Design a binder for this molecule. Structure first.
Ligand SMILES: Nc1ncnc2c1ncn2[C@@H]1O[C@H](COS(=O)(=O)NC(=O)[C@H](N)CS)[C@@H](O)[C@H]1O
Ligand SMILES: [Zn+2]
Length: 399
């Protein structure tokens, strides 16, 4: 699929430390050590409604990772899916009297427009679930052949399941106990009470055809993919075994990322699907609404960057006001004909961003330089432009 248009990205002088990030599996901050091409899969939208600030905050976090990797001289392969076949889409399609395909199309396009407005770097491979059925079917074939998967003994609805015990390491990605898992599974799309499963935690790989649902052919019967195997199959076929980062919101830690990793490790025999599992905090308004109101997308960025990415945080008009004020101050200081030398502040910004994306400290360092420049001035004629270029390249903020 078409992704969206990228902004210009300047080259920033100097060099900083390599990125380190919290890994949900290891439950600690660890070096991210990619090859020449760094690879990241970030779970995309289910396009039944508008981009809210939550989704935005999540893709903005991964935009920072992308930008820092470019700054370090890597090329990037960023893959992101669209879950364009899903129960909530069918529900909304029925409610509003819009074809489910048309709905997914419309909302994906609005997402594109929101991302481009926010100057988020687009993925290199943007893949709709409906375009990846062959890859899912191929993966499910392999899982059935190994005995990792089975077909439930239900003549009417021969659903295909992945065994929760297929991998010895199952559970390492979330660290959650079985009781916690069952509780989350029941809420997050799982079917713990479905008759005939070997284990309540077995995950649907292929939902047998139901009357009224779209379907695709397969060697194990007509139906449609389960959720986790879509992302597993897209990641494996676009990126392969050398996956640096699997990303998304913290709600995906379990079941989704757990099963996606387990499907892949089962098929490939690799110990670990992704080198880092990176999860954003949950935000508690639509991007397009704010834009329609004349809100500067750079203020949206700064507002969402004012807290650390792993923190759950609330959006409010206070957060917006603070972001608008910060944006105005940075614009003032970087419009100065001369200002103090920027070598240290650029170095600090790189240090803080490399330390598990410490945006609050980076923002504070930049505030500091701006206040100093505006209060005492300086003799570097180049520093204001260089600070503006640095904020553009690394934070995606357009001063
Ligand atoms: N309130 C929120 N705050 C921050 N991130 C969120 C929030 N709600 C959902 N997300 C994240 O934004 C995403 C897109 O969410 S979504 O539209 O519900 N889609 C899905 O969860 C997927 N289709 C995963 S394949 C994810 O990566 C998801 O974890
Ligand atoms: Zn996903």
């Amino acid at each position: 699929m078409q992704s969206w248009s990228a902004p210009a990205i300047p080259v920033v002088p100097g060099r900083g430390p390599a990125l380190r990030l919290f890994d949900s599996a290891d439950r600690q901050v660890r070096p991210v050590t990619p090859g020449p091409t760094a690879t990241m899969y970030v779970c995309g939208i289910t396009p039944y409604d508008a981009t809210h600030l939550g989704h935005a905050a999540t893709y903005l976090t991964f935009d920072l990772v992308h930008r820092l990797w470019l700054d370090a001289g890597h090329t990037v392969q960023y893959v992101q899916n669209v879950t364009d076949v899903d129960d909530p889409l069918f529900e909304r399609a029925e409610r509003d009297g819009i074809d489910w395909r048309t709905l997914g199309d419309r909302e994906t396009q609005l997402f594109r427009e929101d991302m481009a407005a926010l100057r988020v770097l687009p993925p290199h491979d943007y893949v709709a679930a409906t375009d990846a059925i062959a890859e899912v079917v191929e993966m499910v074939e392999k899982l059935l052949a190994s005995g990792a998967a089975y077909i439930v003994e239900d003549a009417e609805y021969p659903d295909v399941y992945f065994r929760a015990d297929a991998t010895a390491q199952f559970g390492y990605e979330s660290g959650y106990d079985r009781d916690t898992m069952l509780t989350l599974f029941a809420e997050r799309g799982g079917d713990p009470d479905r008759p005939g499963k070997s284990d309540q935690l077995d995950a649907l790989l292929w939902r047998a055809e139901r009357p009224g649902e779209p379907s695709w052919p397969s060697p194990f019967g007509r139906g449609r993919p389960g959720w986790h195997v879509e992302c597993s199959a897209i990641a494996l076929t676009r990126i392969g075994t050398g996956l640096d980062i699997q990303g998304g919101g913290s709600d995906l830690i379990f079941p989704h990322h757990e099963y996606s990793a387990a499907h892949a490790e089962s098929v490939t025999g690799e110990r670990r699907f992704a080198r880092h599992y990176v999860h954003t905090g949950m935000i508690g308004v639509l991007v397009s609404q704010l834009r329609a109101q004349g809100v500067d997308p750079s203020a949206i960025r700064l507002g969402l960057f004012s807290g650390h990415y792993r923190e759950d945080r609330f959006w409010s008009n206070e957060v917006l006001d603070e972001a608008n004020a910060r944006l105005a101050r940075w614009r003032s200081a970087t419009a100065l004909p001369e200002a103090p030398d920027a070598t240290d502040v650029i170095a600090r910004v790189r240090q803080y961003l490399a330390d598990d994306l410490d945006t609050p400290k980076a923002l504070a360092a930049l505030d500091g330089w701006c206040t100093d420049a505006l209060s005492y001035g300086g003799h570097d004629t180049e520093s204001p432009r260089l600070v503006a270029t640095t904020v553009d390249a690394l934070l995606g903020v357009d001063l």
